[PDB]
């Protein structure tokens, strides 16, 4: 029930010849398909048209892997093509996971996104990563998801569970709105908004007025966004909101010596920490904090399997390191990363 042309690097312009159509034979004959993967090809509008017609029919569709499918297409043709495909997907009752990452979108192609995302109630896992949405469009996509929230409650449909939206420069421009998108979907499990130029004020909001309402949250990654003391304090306060937190990715966030200081302190106070993987790279975290983070990991973080401090402000030599590595050894389960790049 799986159809795929992954990596076939096809310059799919039309799909009309005897061949070309043969490629999508498995698509035409089998109507009981669950996953369609198109990644690794360039779909022109014409071919997009032919694939739209042949996708609506696949009513048992559950996954649409549309990541990387336009490499080479200009503004002149992506929006149309995207529109047609998303038009079809909309007609799939069981489609819970759709992936549109690695495609040049931004404002110039927000239409299909804004449409589709607000309507497709069956959606549970959204993969909108590296699309260059931008603060402007990012916001519309965010509102569009708020809508979906509503249209979902109207049809008693499953809650949205995963939003993987990074490398889109959502910036602070769209944090006001995204924070609302979260207030909407308080049942998310995986939210990853990595590398969106979101600065301090941005994260403070996104946190305290956004994610903080997702009590169900399991995995949160805000990698490569400027946090600083402001962001950290937010993060500290908010930690108590995610009990079932298991993965916390803060690599490259400039938490600041003072910030990490508090975040660590924050965990110190948490109870029944089921955390399983903490990424704290490049945050200028100083030794005194790493010192405390250790004892905390030891006493209160029994399930930690991964740690990452590479890149901060404390010598790869310093006692604490070995003490940490030692903690996982005694346990038989644990793993610190390689500190081959400390700051200063």
């Amino acid at each position: 029930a799986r159809f795929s042309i992954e990596g076939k690097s096809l310059k799919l312009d039309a799909i009309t010849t005897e061949d070309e159509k043969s490629v999508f034979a498995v698509l035409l004959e089998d109507d009981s398909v669950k996953e369609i993967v198109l990644s690794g090809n360039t779909i022109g509008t014409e071919a997009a048209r032919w694939l739209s017609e042949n996708i609506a029919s696949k009513k048992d569709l559950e996954i649409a892997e549309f990541s990387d499918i336009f490499t080479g297409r200009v503004k002149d043709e992506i929006p149309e093509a995207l529109r047609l495909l998303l038009q079809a997907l909309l007609k799939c009752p069981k489609l819970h996971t759709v992936r549109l990452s690695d495609n040049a979108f931004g404002p110039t192609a927000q239409e299909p996104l804004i449409d589709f995302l607000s309507k497709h109630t069956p959606l549970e896992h959204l993969y909108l990563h590296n699309n260059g949405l931008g603060p402007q469009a990012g916001a519309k996509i965010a509102r569009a998801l708020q809508e979906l929230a509503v249209n979902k409650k109207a049809k008693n449909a499953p809650p949205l569970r995963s939003i993987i939206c990074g490398r889109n420069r959502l910036e602070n421009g769209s944090m006001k709105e995204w924070a609302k998108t979260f207030q909407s979907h308080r049942l998310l499990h995986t939210v990853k908004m990595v590398q969106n130029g979101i600065r301090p004020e941005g994260i403070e909001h996104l946190l305290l007025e956004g994610l903080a309402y997702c009590q169900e949250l399991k995995v949160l990654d805000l990698q490569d966004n400027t946090f600083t003391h402001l962001g950290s304090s937010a993060l500290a306060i908010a930690l108590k909101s995610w009990p079932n937190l298991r993965e916390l990715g803060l690599n490259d966030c400039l938490l600041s010596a003072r910030g990490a200081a508090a975040v660590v302190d924050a965990f110190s106070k948490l109870e029944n920490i089921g955390l399983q993987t903490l990424r704290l790279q490049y945050n200028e975290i100083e030794l005194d904090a790493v010192r405390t983070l250790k004892t905390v990991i030891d006493e209160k973080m029994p399930d930690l399997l991964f740690l990452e401090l590479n890149g901060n402000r404390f010598s790869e030599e310093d006692d604490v390191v070995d003490e940490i590595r030692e903690v996982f050894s005694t346990r038989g389960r644990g793993e610190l990363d390689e500190l081959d790049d400390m700051e200063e």
Binding site: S9, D102, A104, P107, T108, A109, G132, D224
Partner: protein
């Protein structure tokens, strides 16, 4: 009239277009508008060895590196890889750009640009940058915003391509502005906009 095909590549939202834009309008496009596919913008410069034209092939930073990109790379003669000094993630990707690039071009001048050096909280500092040492690239901190070094990249490649260590930009023949007559309907409603201007305050950043 010499023409050079320069490939501008790099992670999205770094500055490729902003940079190129400024270089042909002087404007600092502050709005982030994703470049679908590839836009070919030509820039001409005048040197002590005549005028040269760079055909900047501005590319899209989402497109996964691979053969599907070959078109841009083919017959290029130089290139600029760009990354955001405030995005560690963006720098970590330089390697992939410089590879998917040297796979079809092999040996060609390439300048690595860490843009937005103007931003306060910087992540990829001047020191740490090494990649250029290990792959024979020229490197420049730049800021499409403050213009810091904004012209070094072209200046370099030009010297490298032309083969004149001491090549330099010079003047630019200022031709005679055309006639300038008329007046009737070809005016009047101009004062209307001239005022819509003298009213709208100038973005003072100095």
């Amino acid at each position: 009239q010499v023409q050079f095909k320069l490939v501008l590549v790099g992670d999205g939202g770094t500055g490729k277009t902003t940079f190129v834009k400024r270089h042909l309008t002087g404007e600092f496009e502050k709005k982030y508008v994703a470049t679908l596919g590839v836009e070919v913008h030509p820039l001409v410069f005048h040197t002590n060895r005549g005028p040269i034209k760079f055909n900047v092939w501005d590319t899209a930073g989402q497109e996964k590196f691979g053969g599907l990109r070959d078109g841009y790379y083919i017959q290029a003669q130089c290139a600029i890889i760009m990354f955001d000094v405030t995005s560690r993630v963006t720098y970590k990707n330089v390697p992939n750009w410089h590879r998917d690039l040297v796979r079809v071009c092999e040996n060609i001048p390439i300048v690595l640009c860490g843009n937005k050096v103007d931003i306060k909280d910087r992540k990829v500092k001047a020191k740490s940058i090494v990649f250029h040492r290990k792959k024979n690239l020229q490197y420049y901190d730049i800021s499409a915003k403050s213009n810091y070094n904004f012209e070094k990249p072209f200046l370099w490649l030009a010297r490298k391509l032309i083969g004149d260590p001491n090549l330099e930009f010079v003047a630019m023949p200022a031709l005679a502005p055309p006639e300038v007559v008329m007046d009737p309907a070809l005016a009047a409603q101009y004062e209307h906009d001239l005022e819509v201007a003298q009213t709208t305050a100038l973005p003072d950043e100095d």
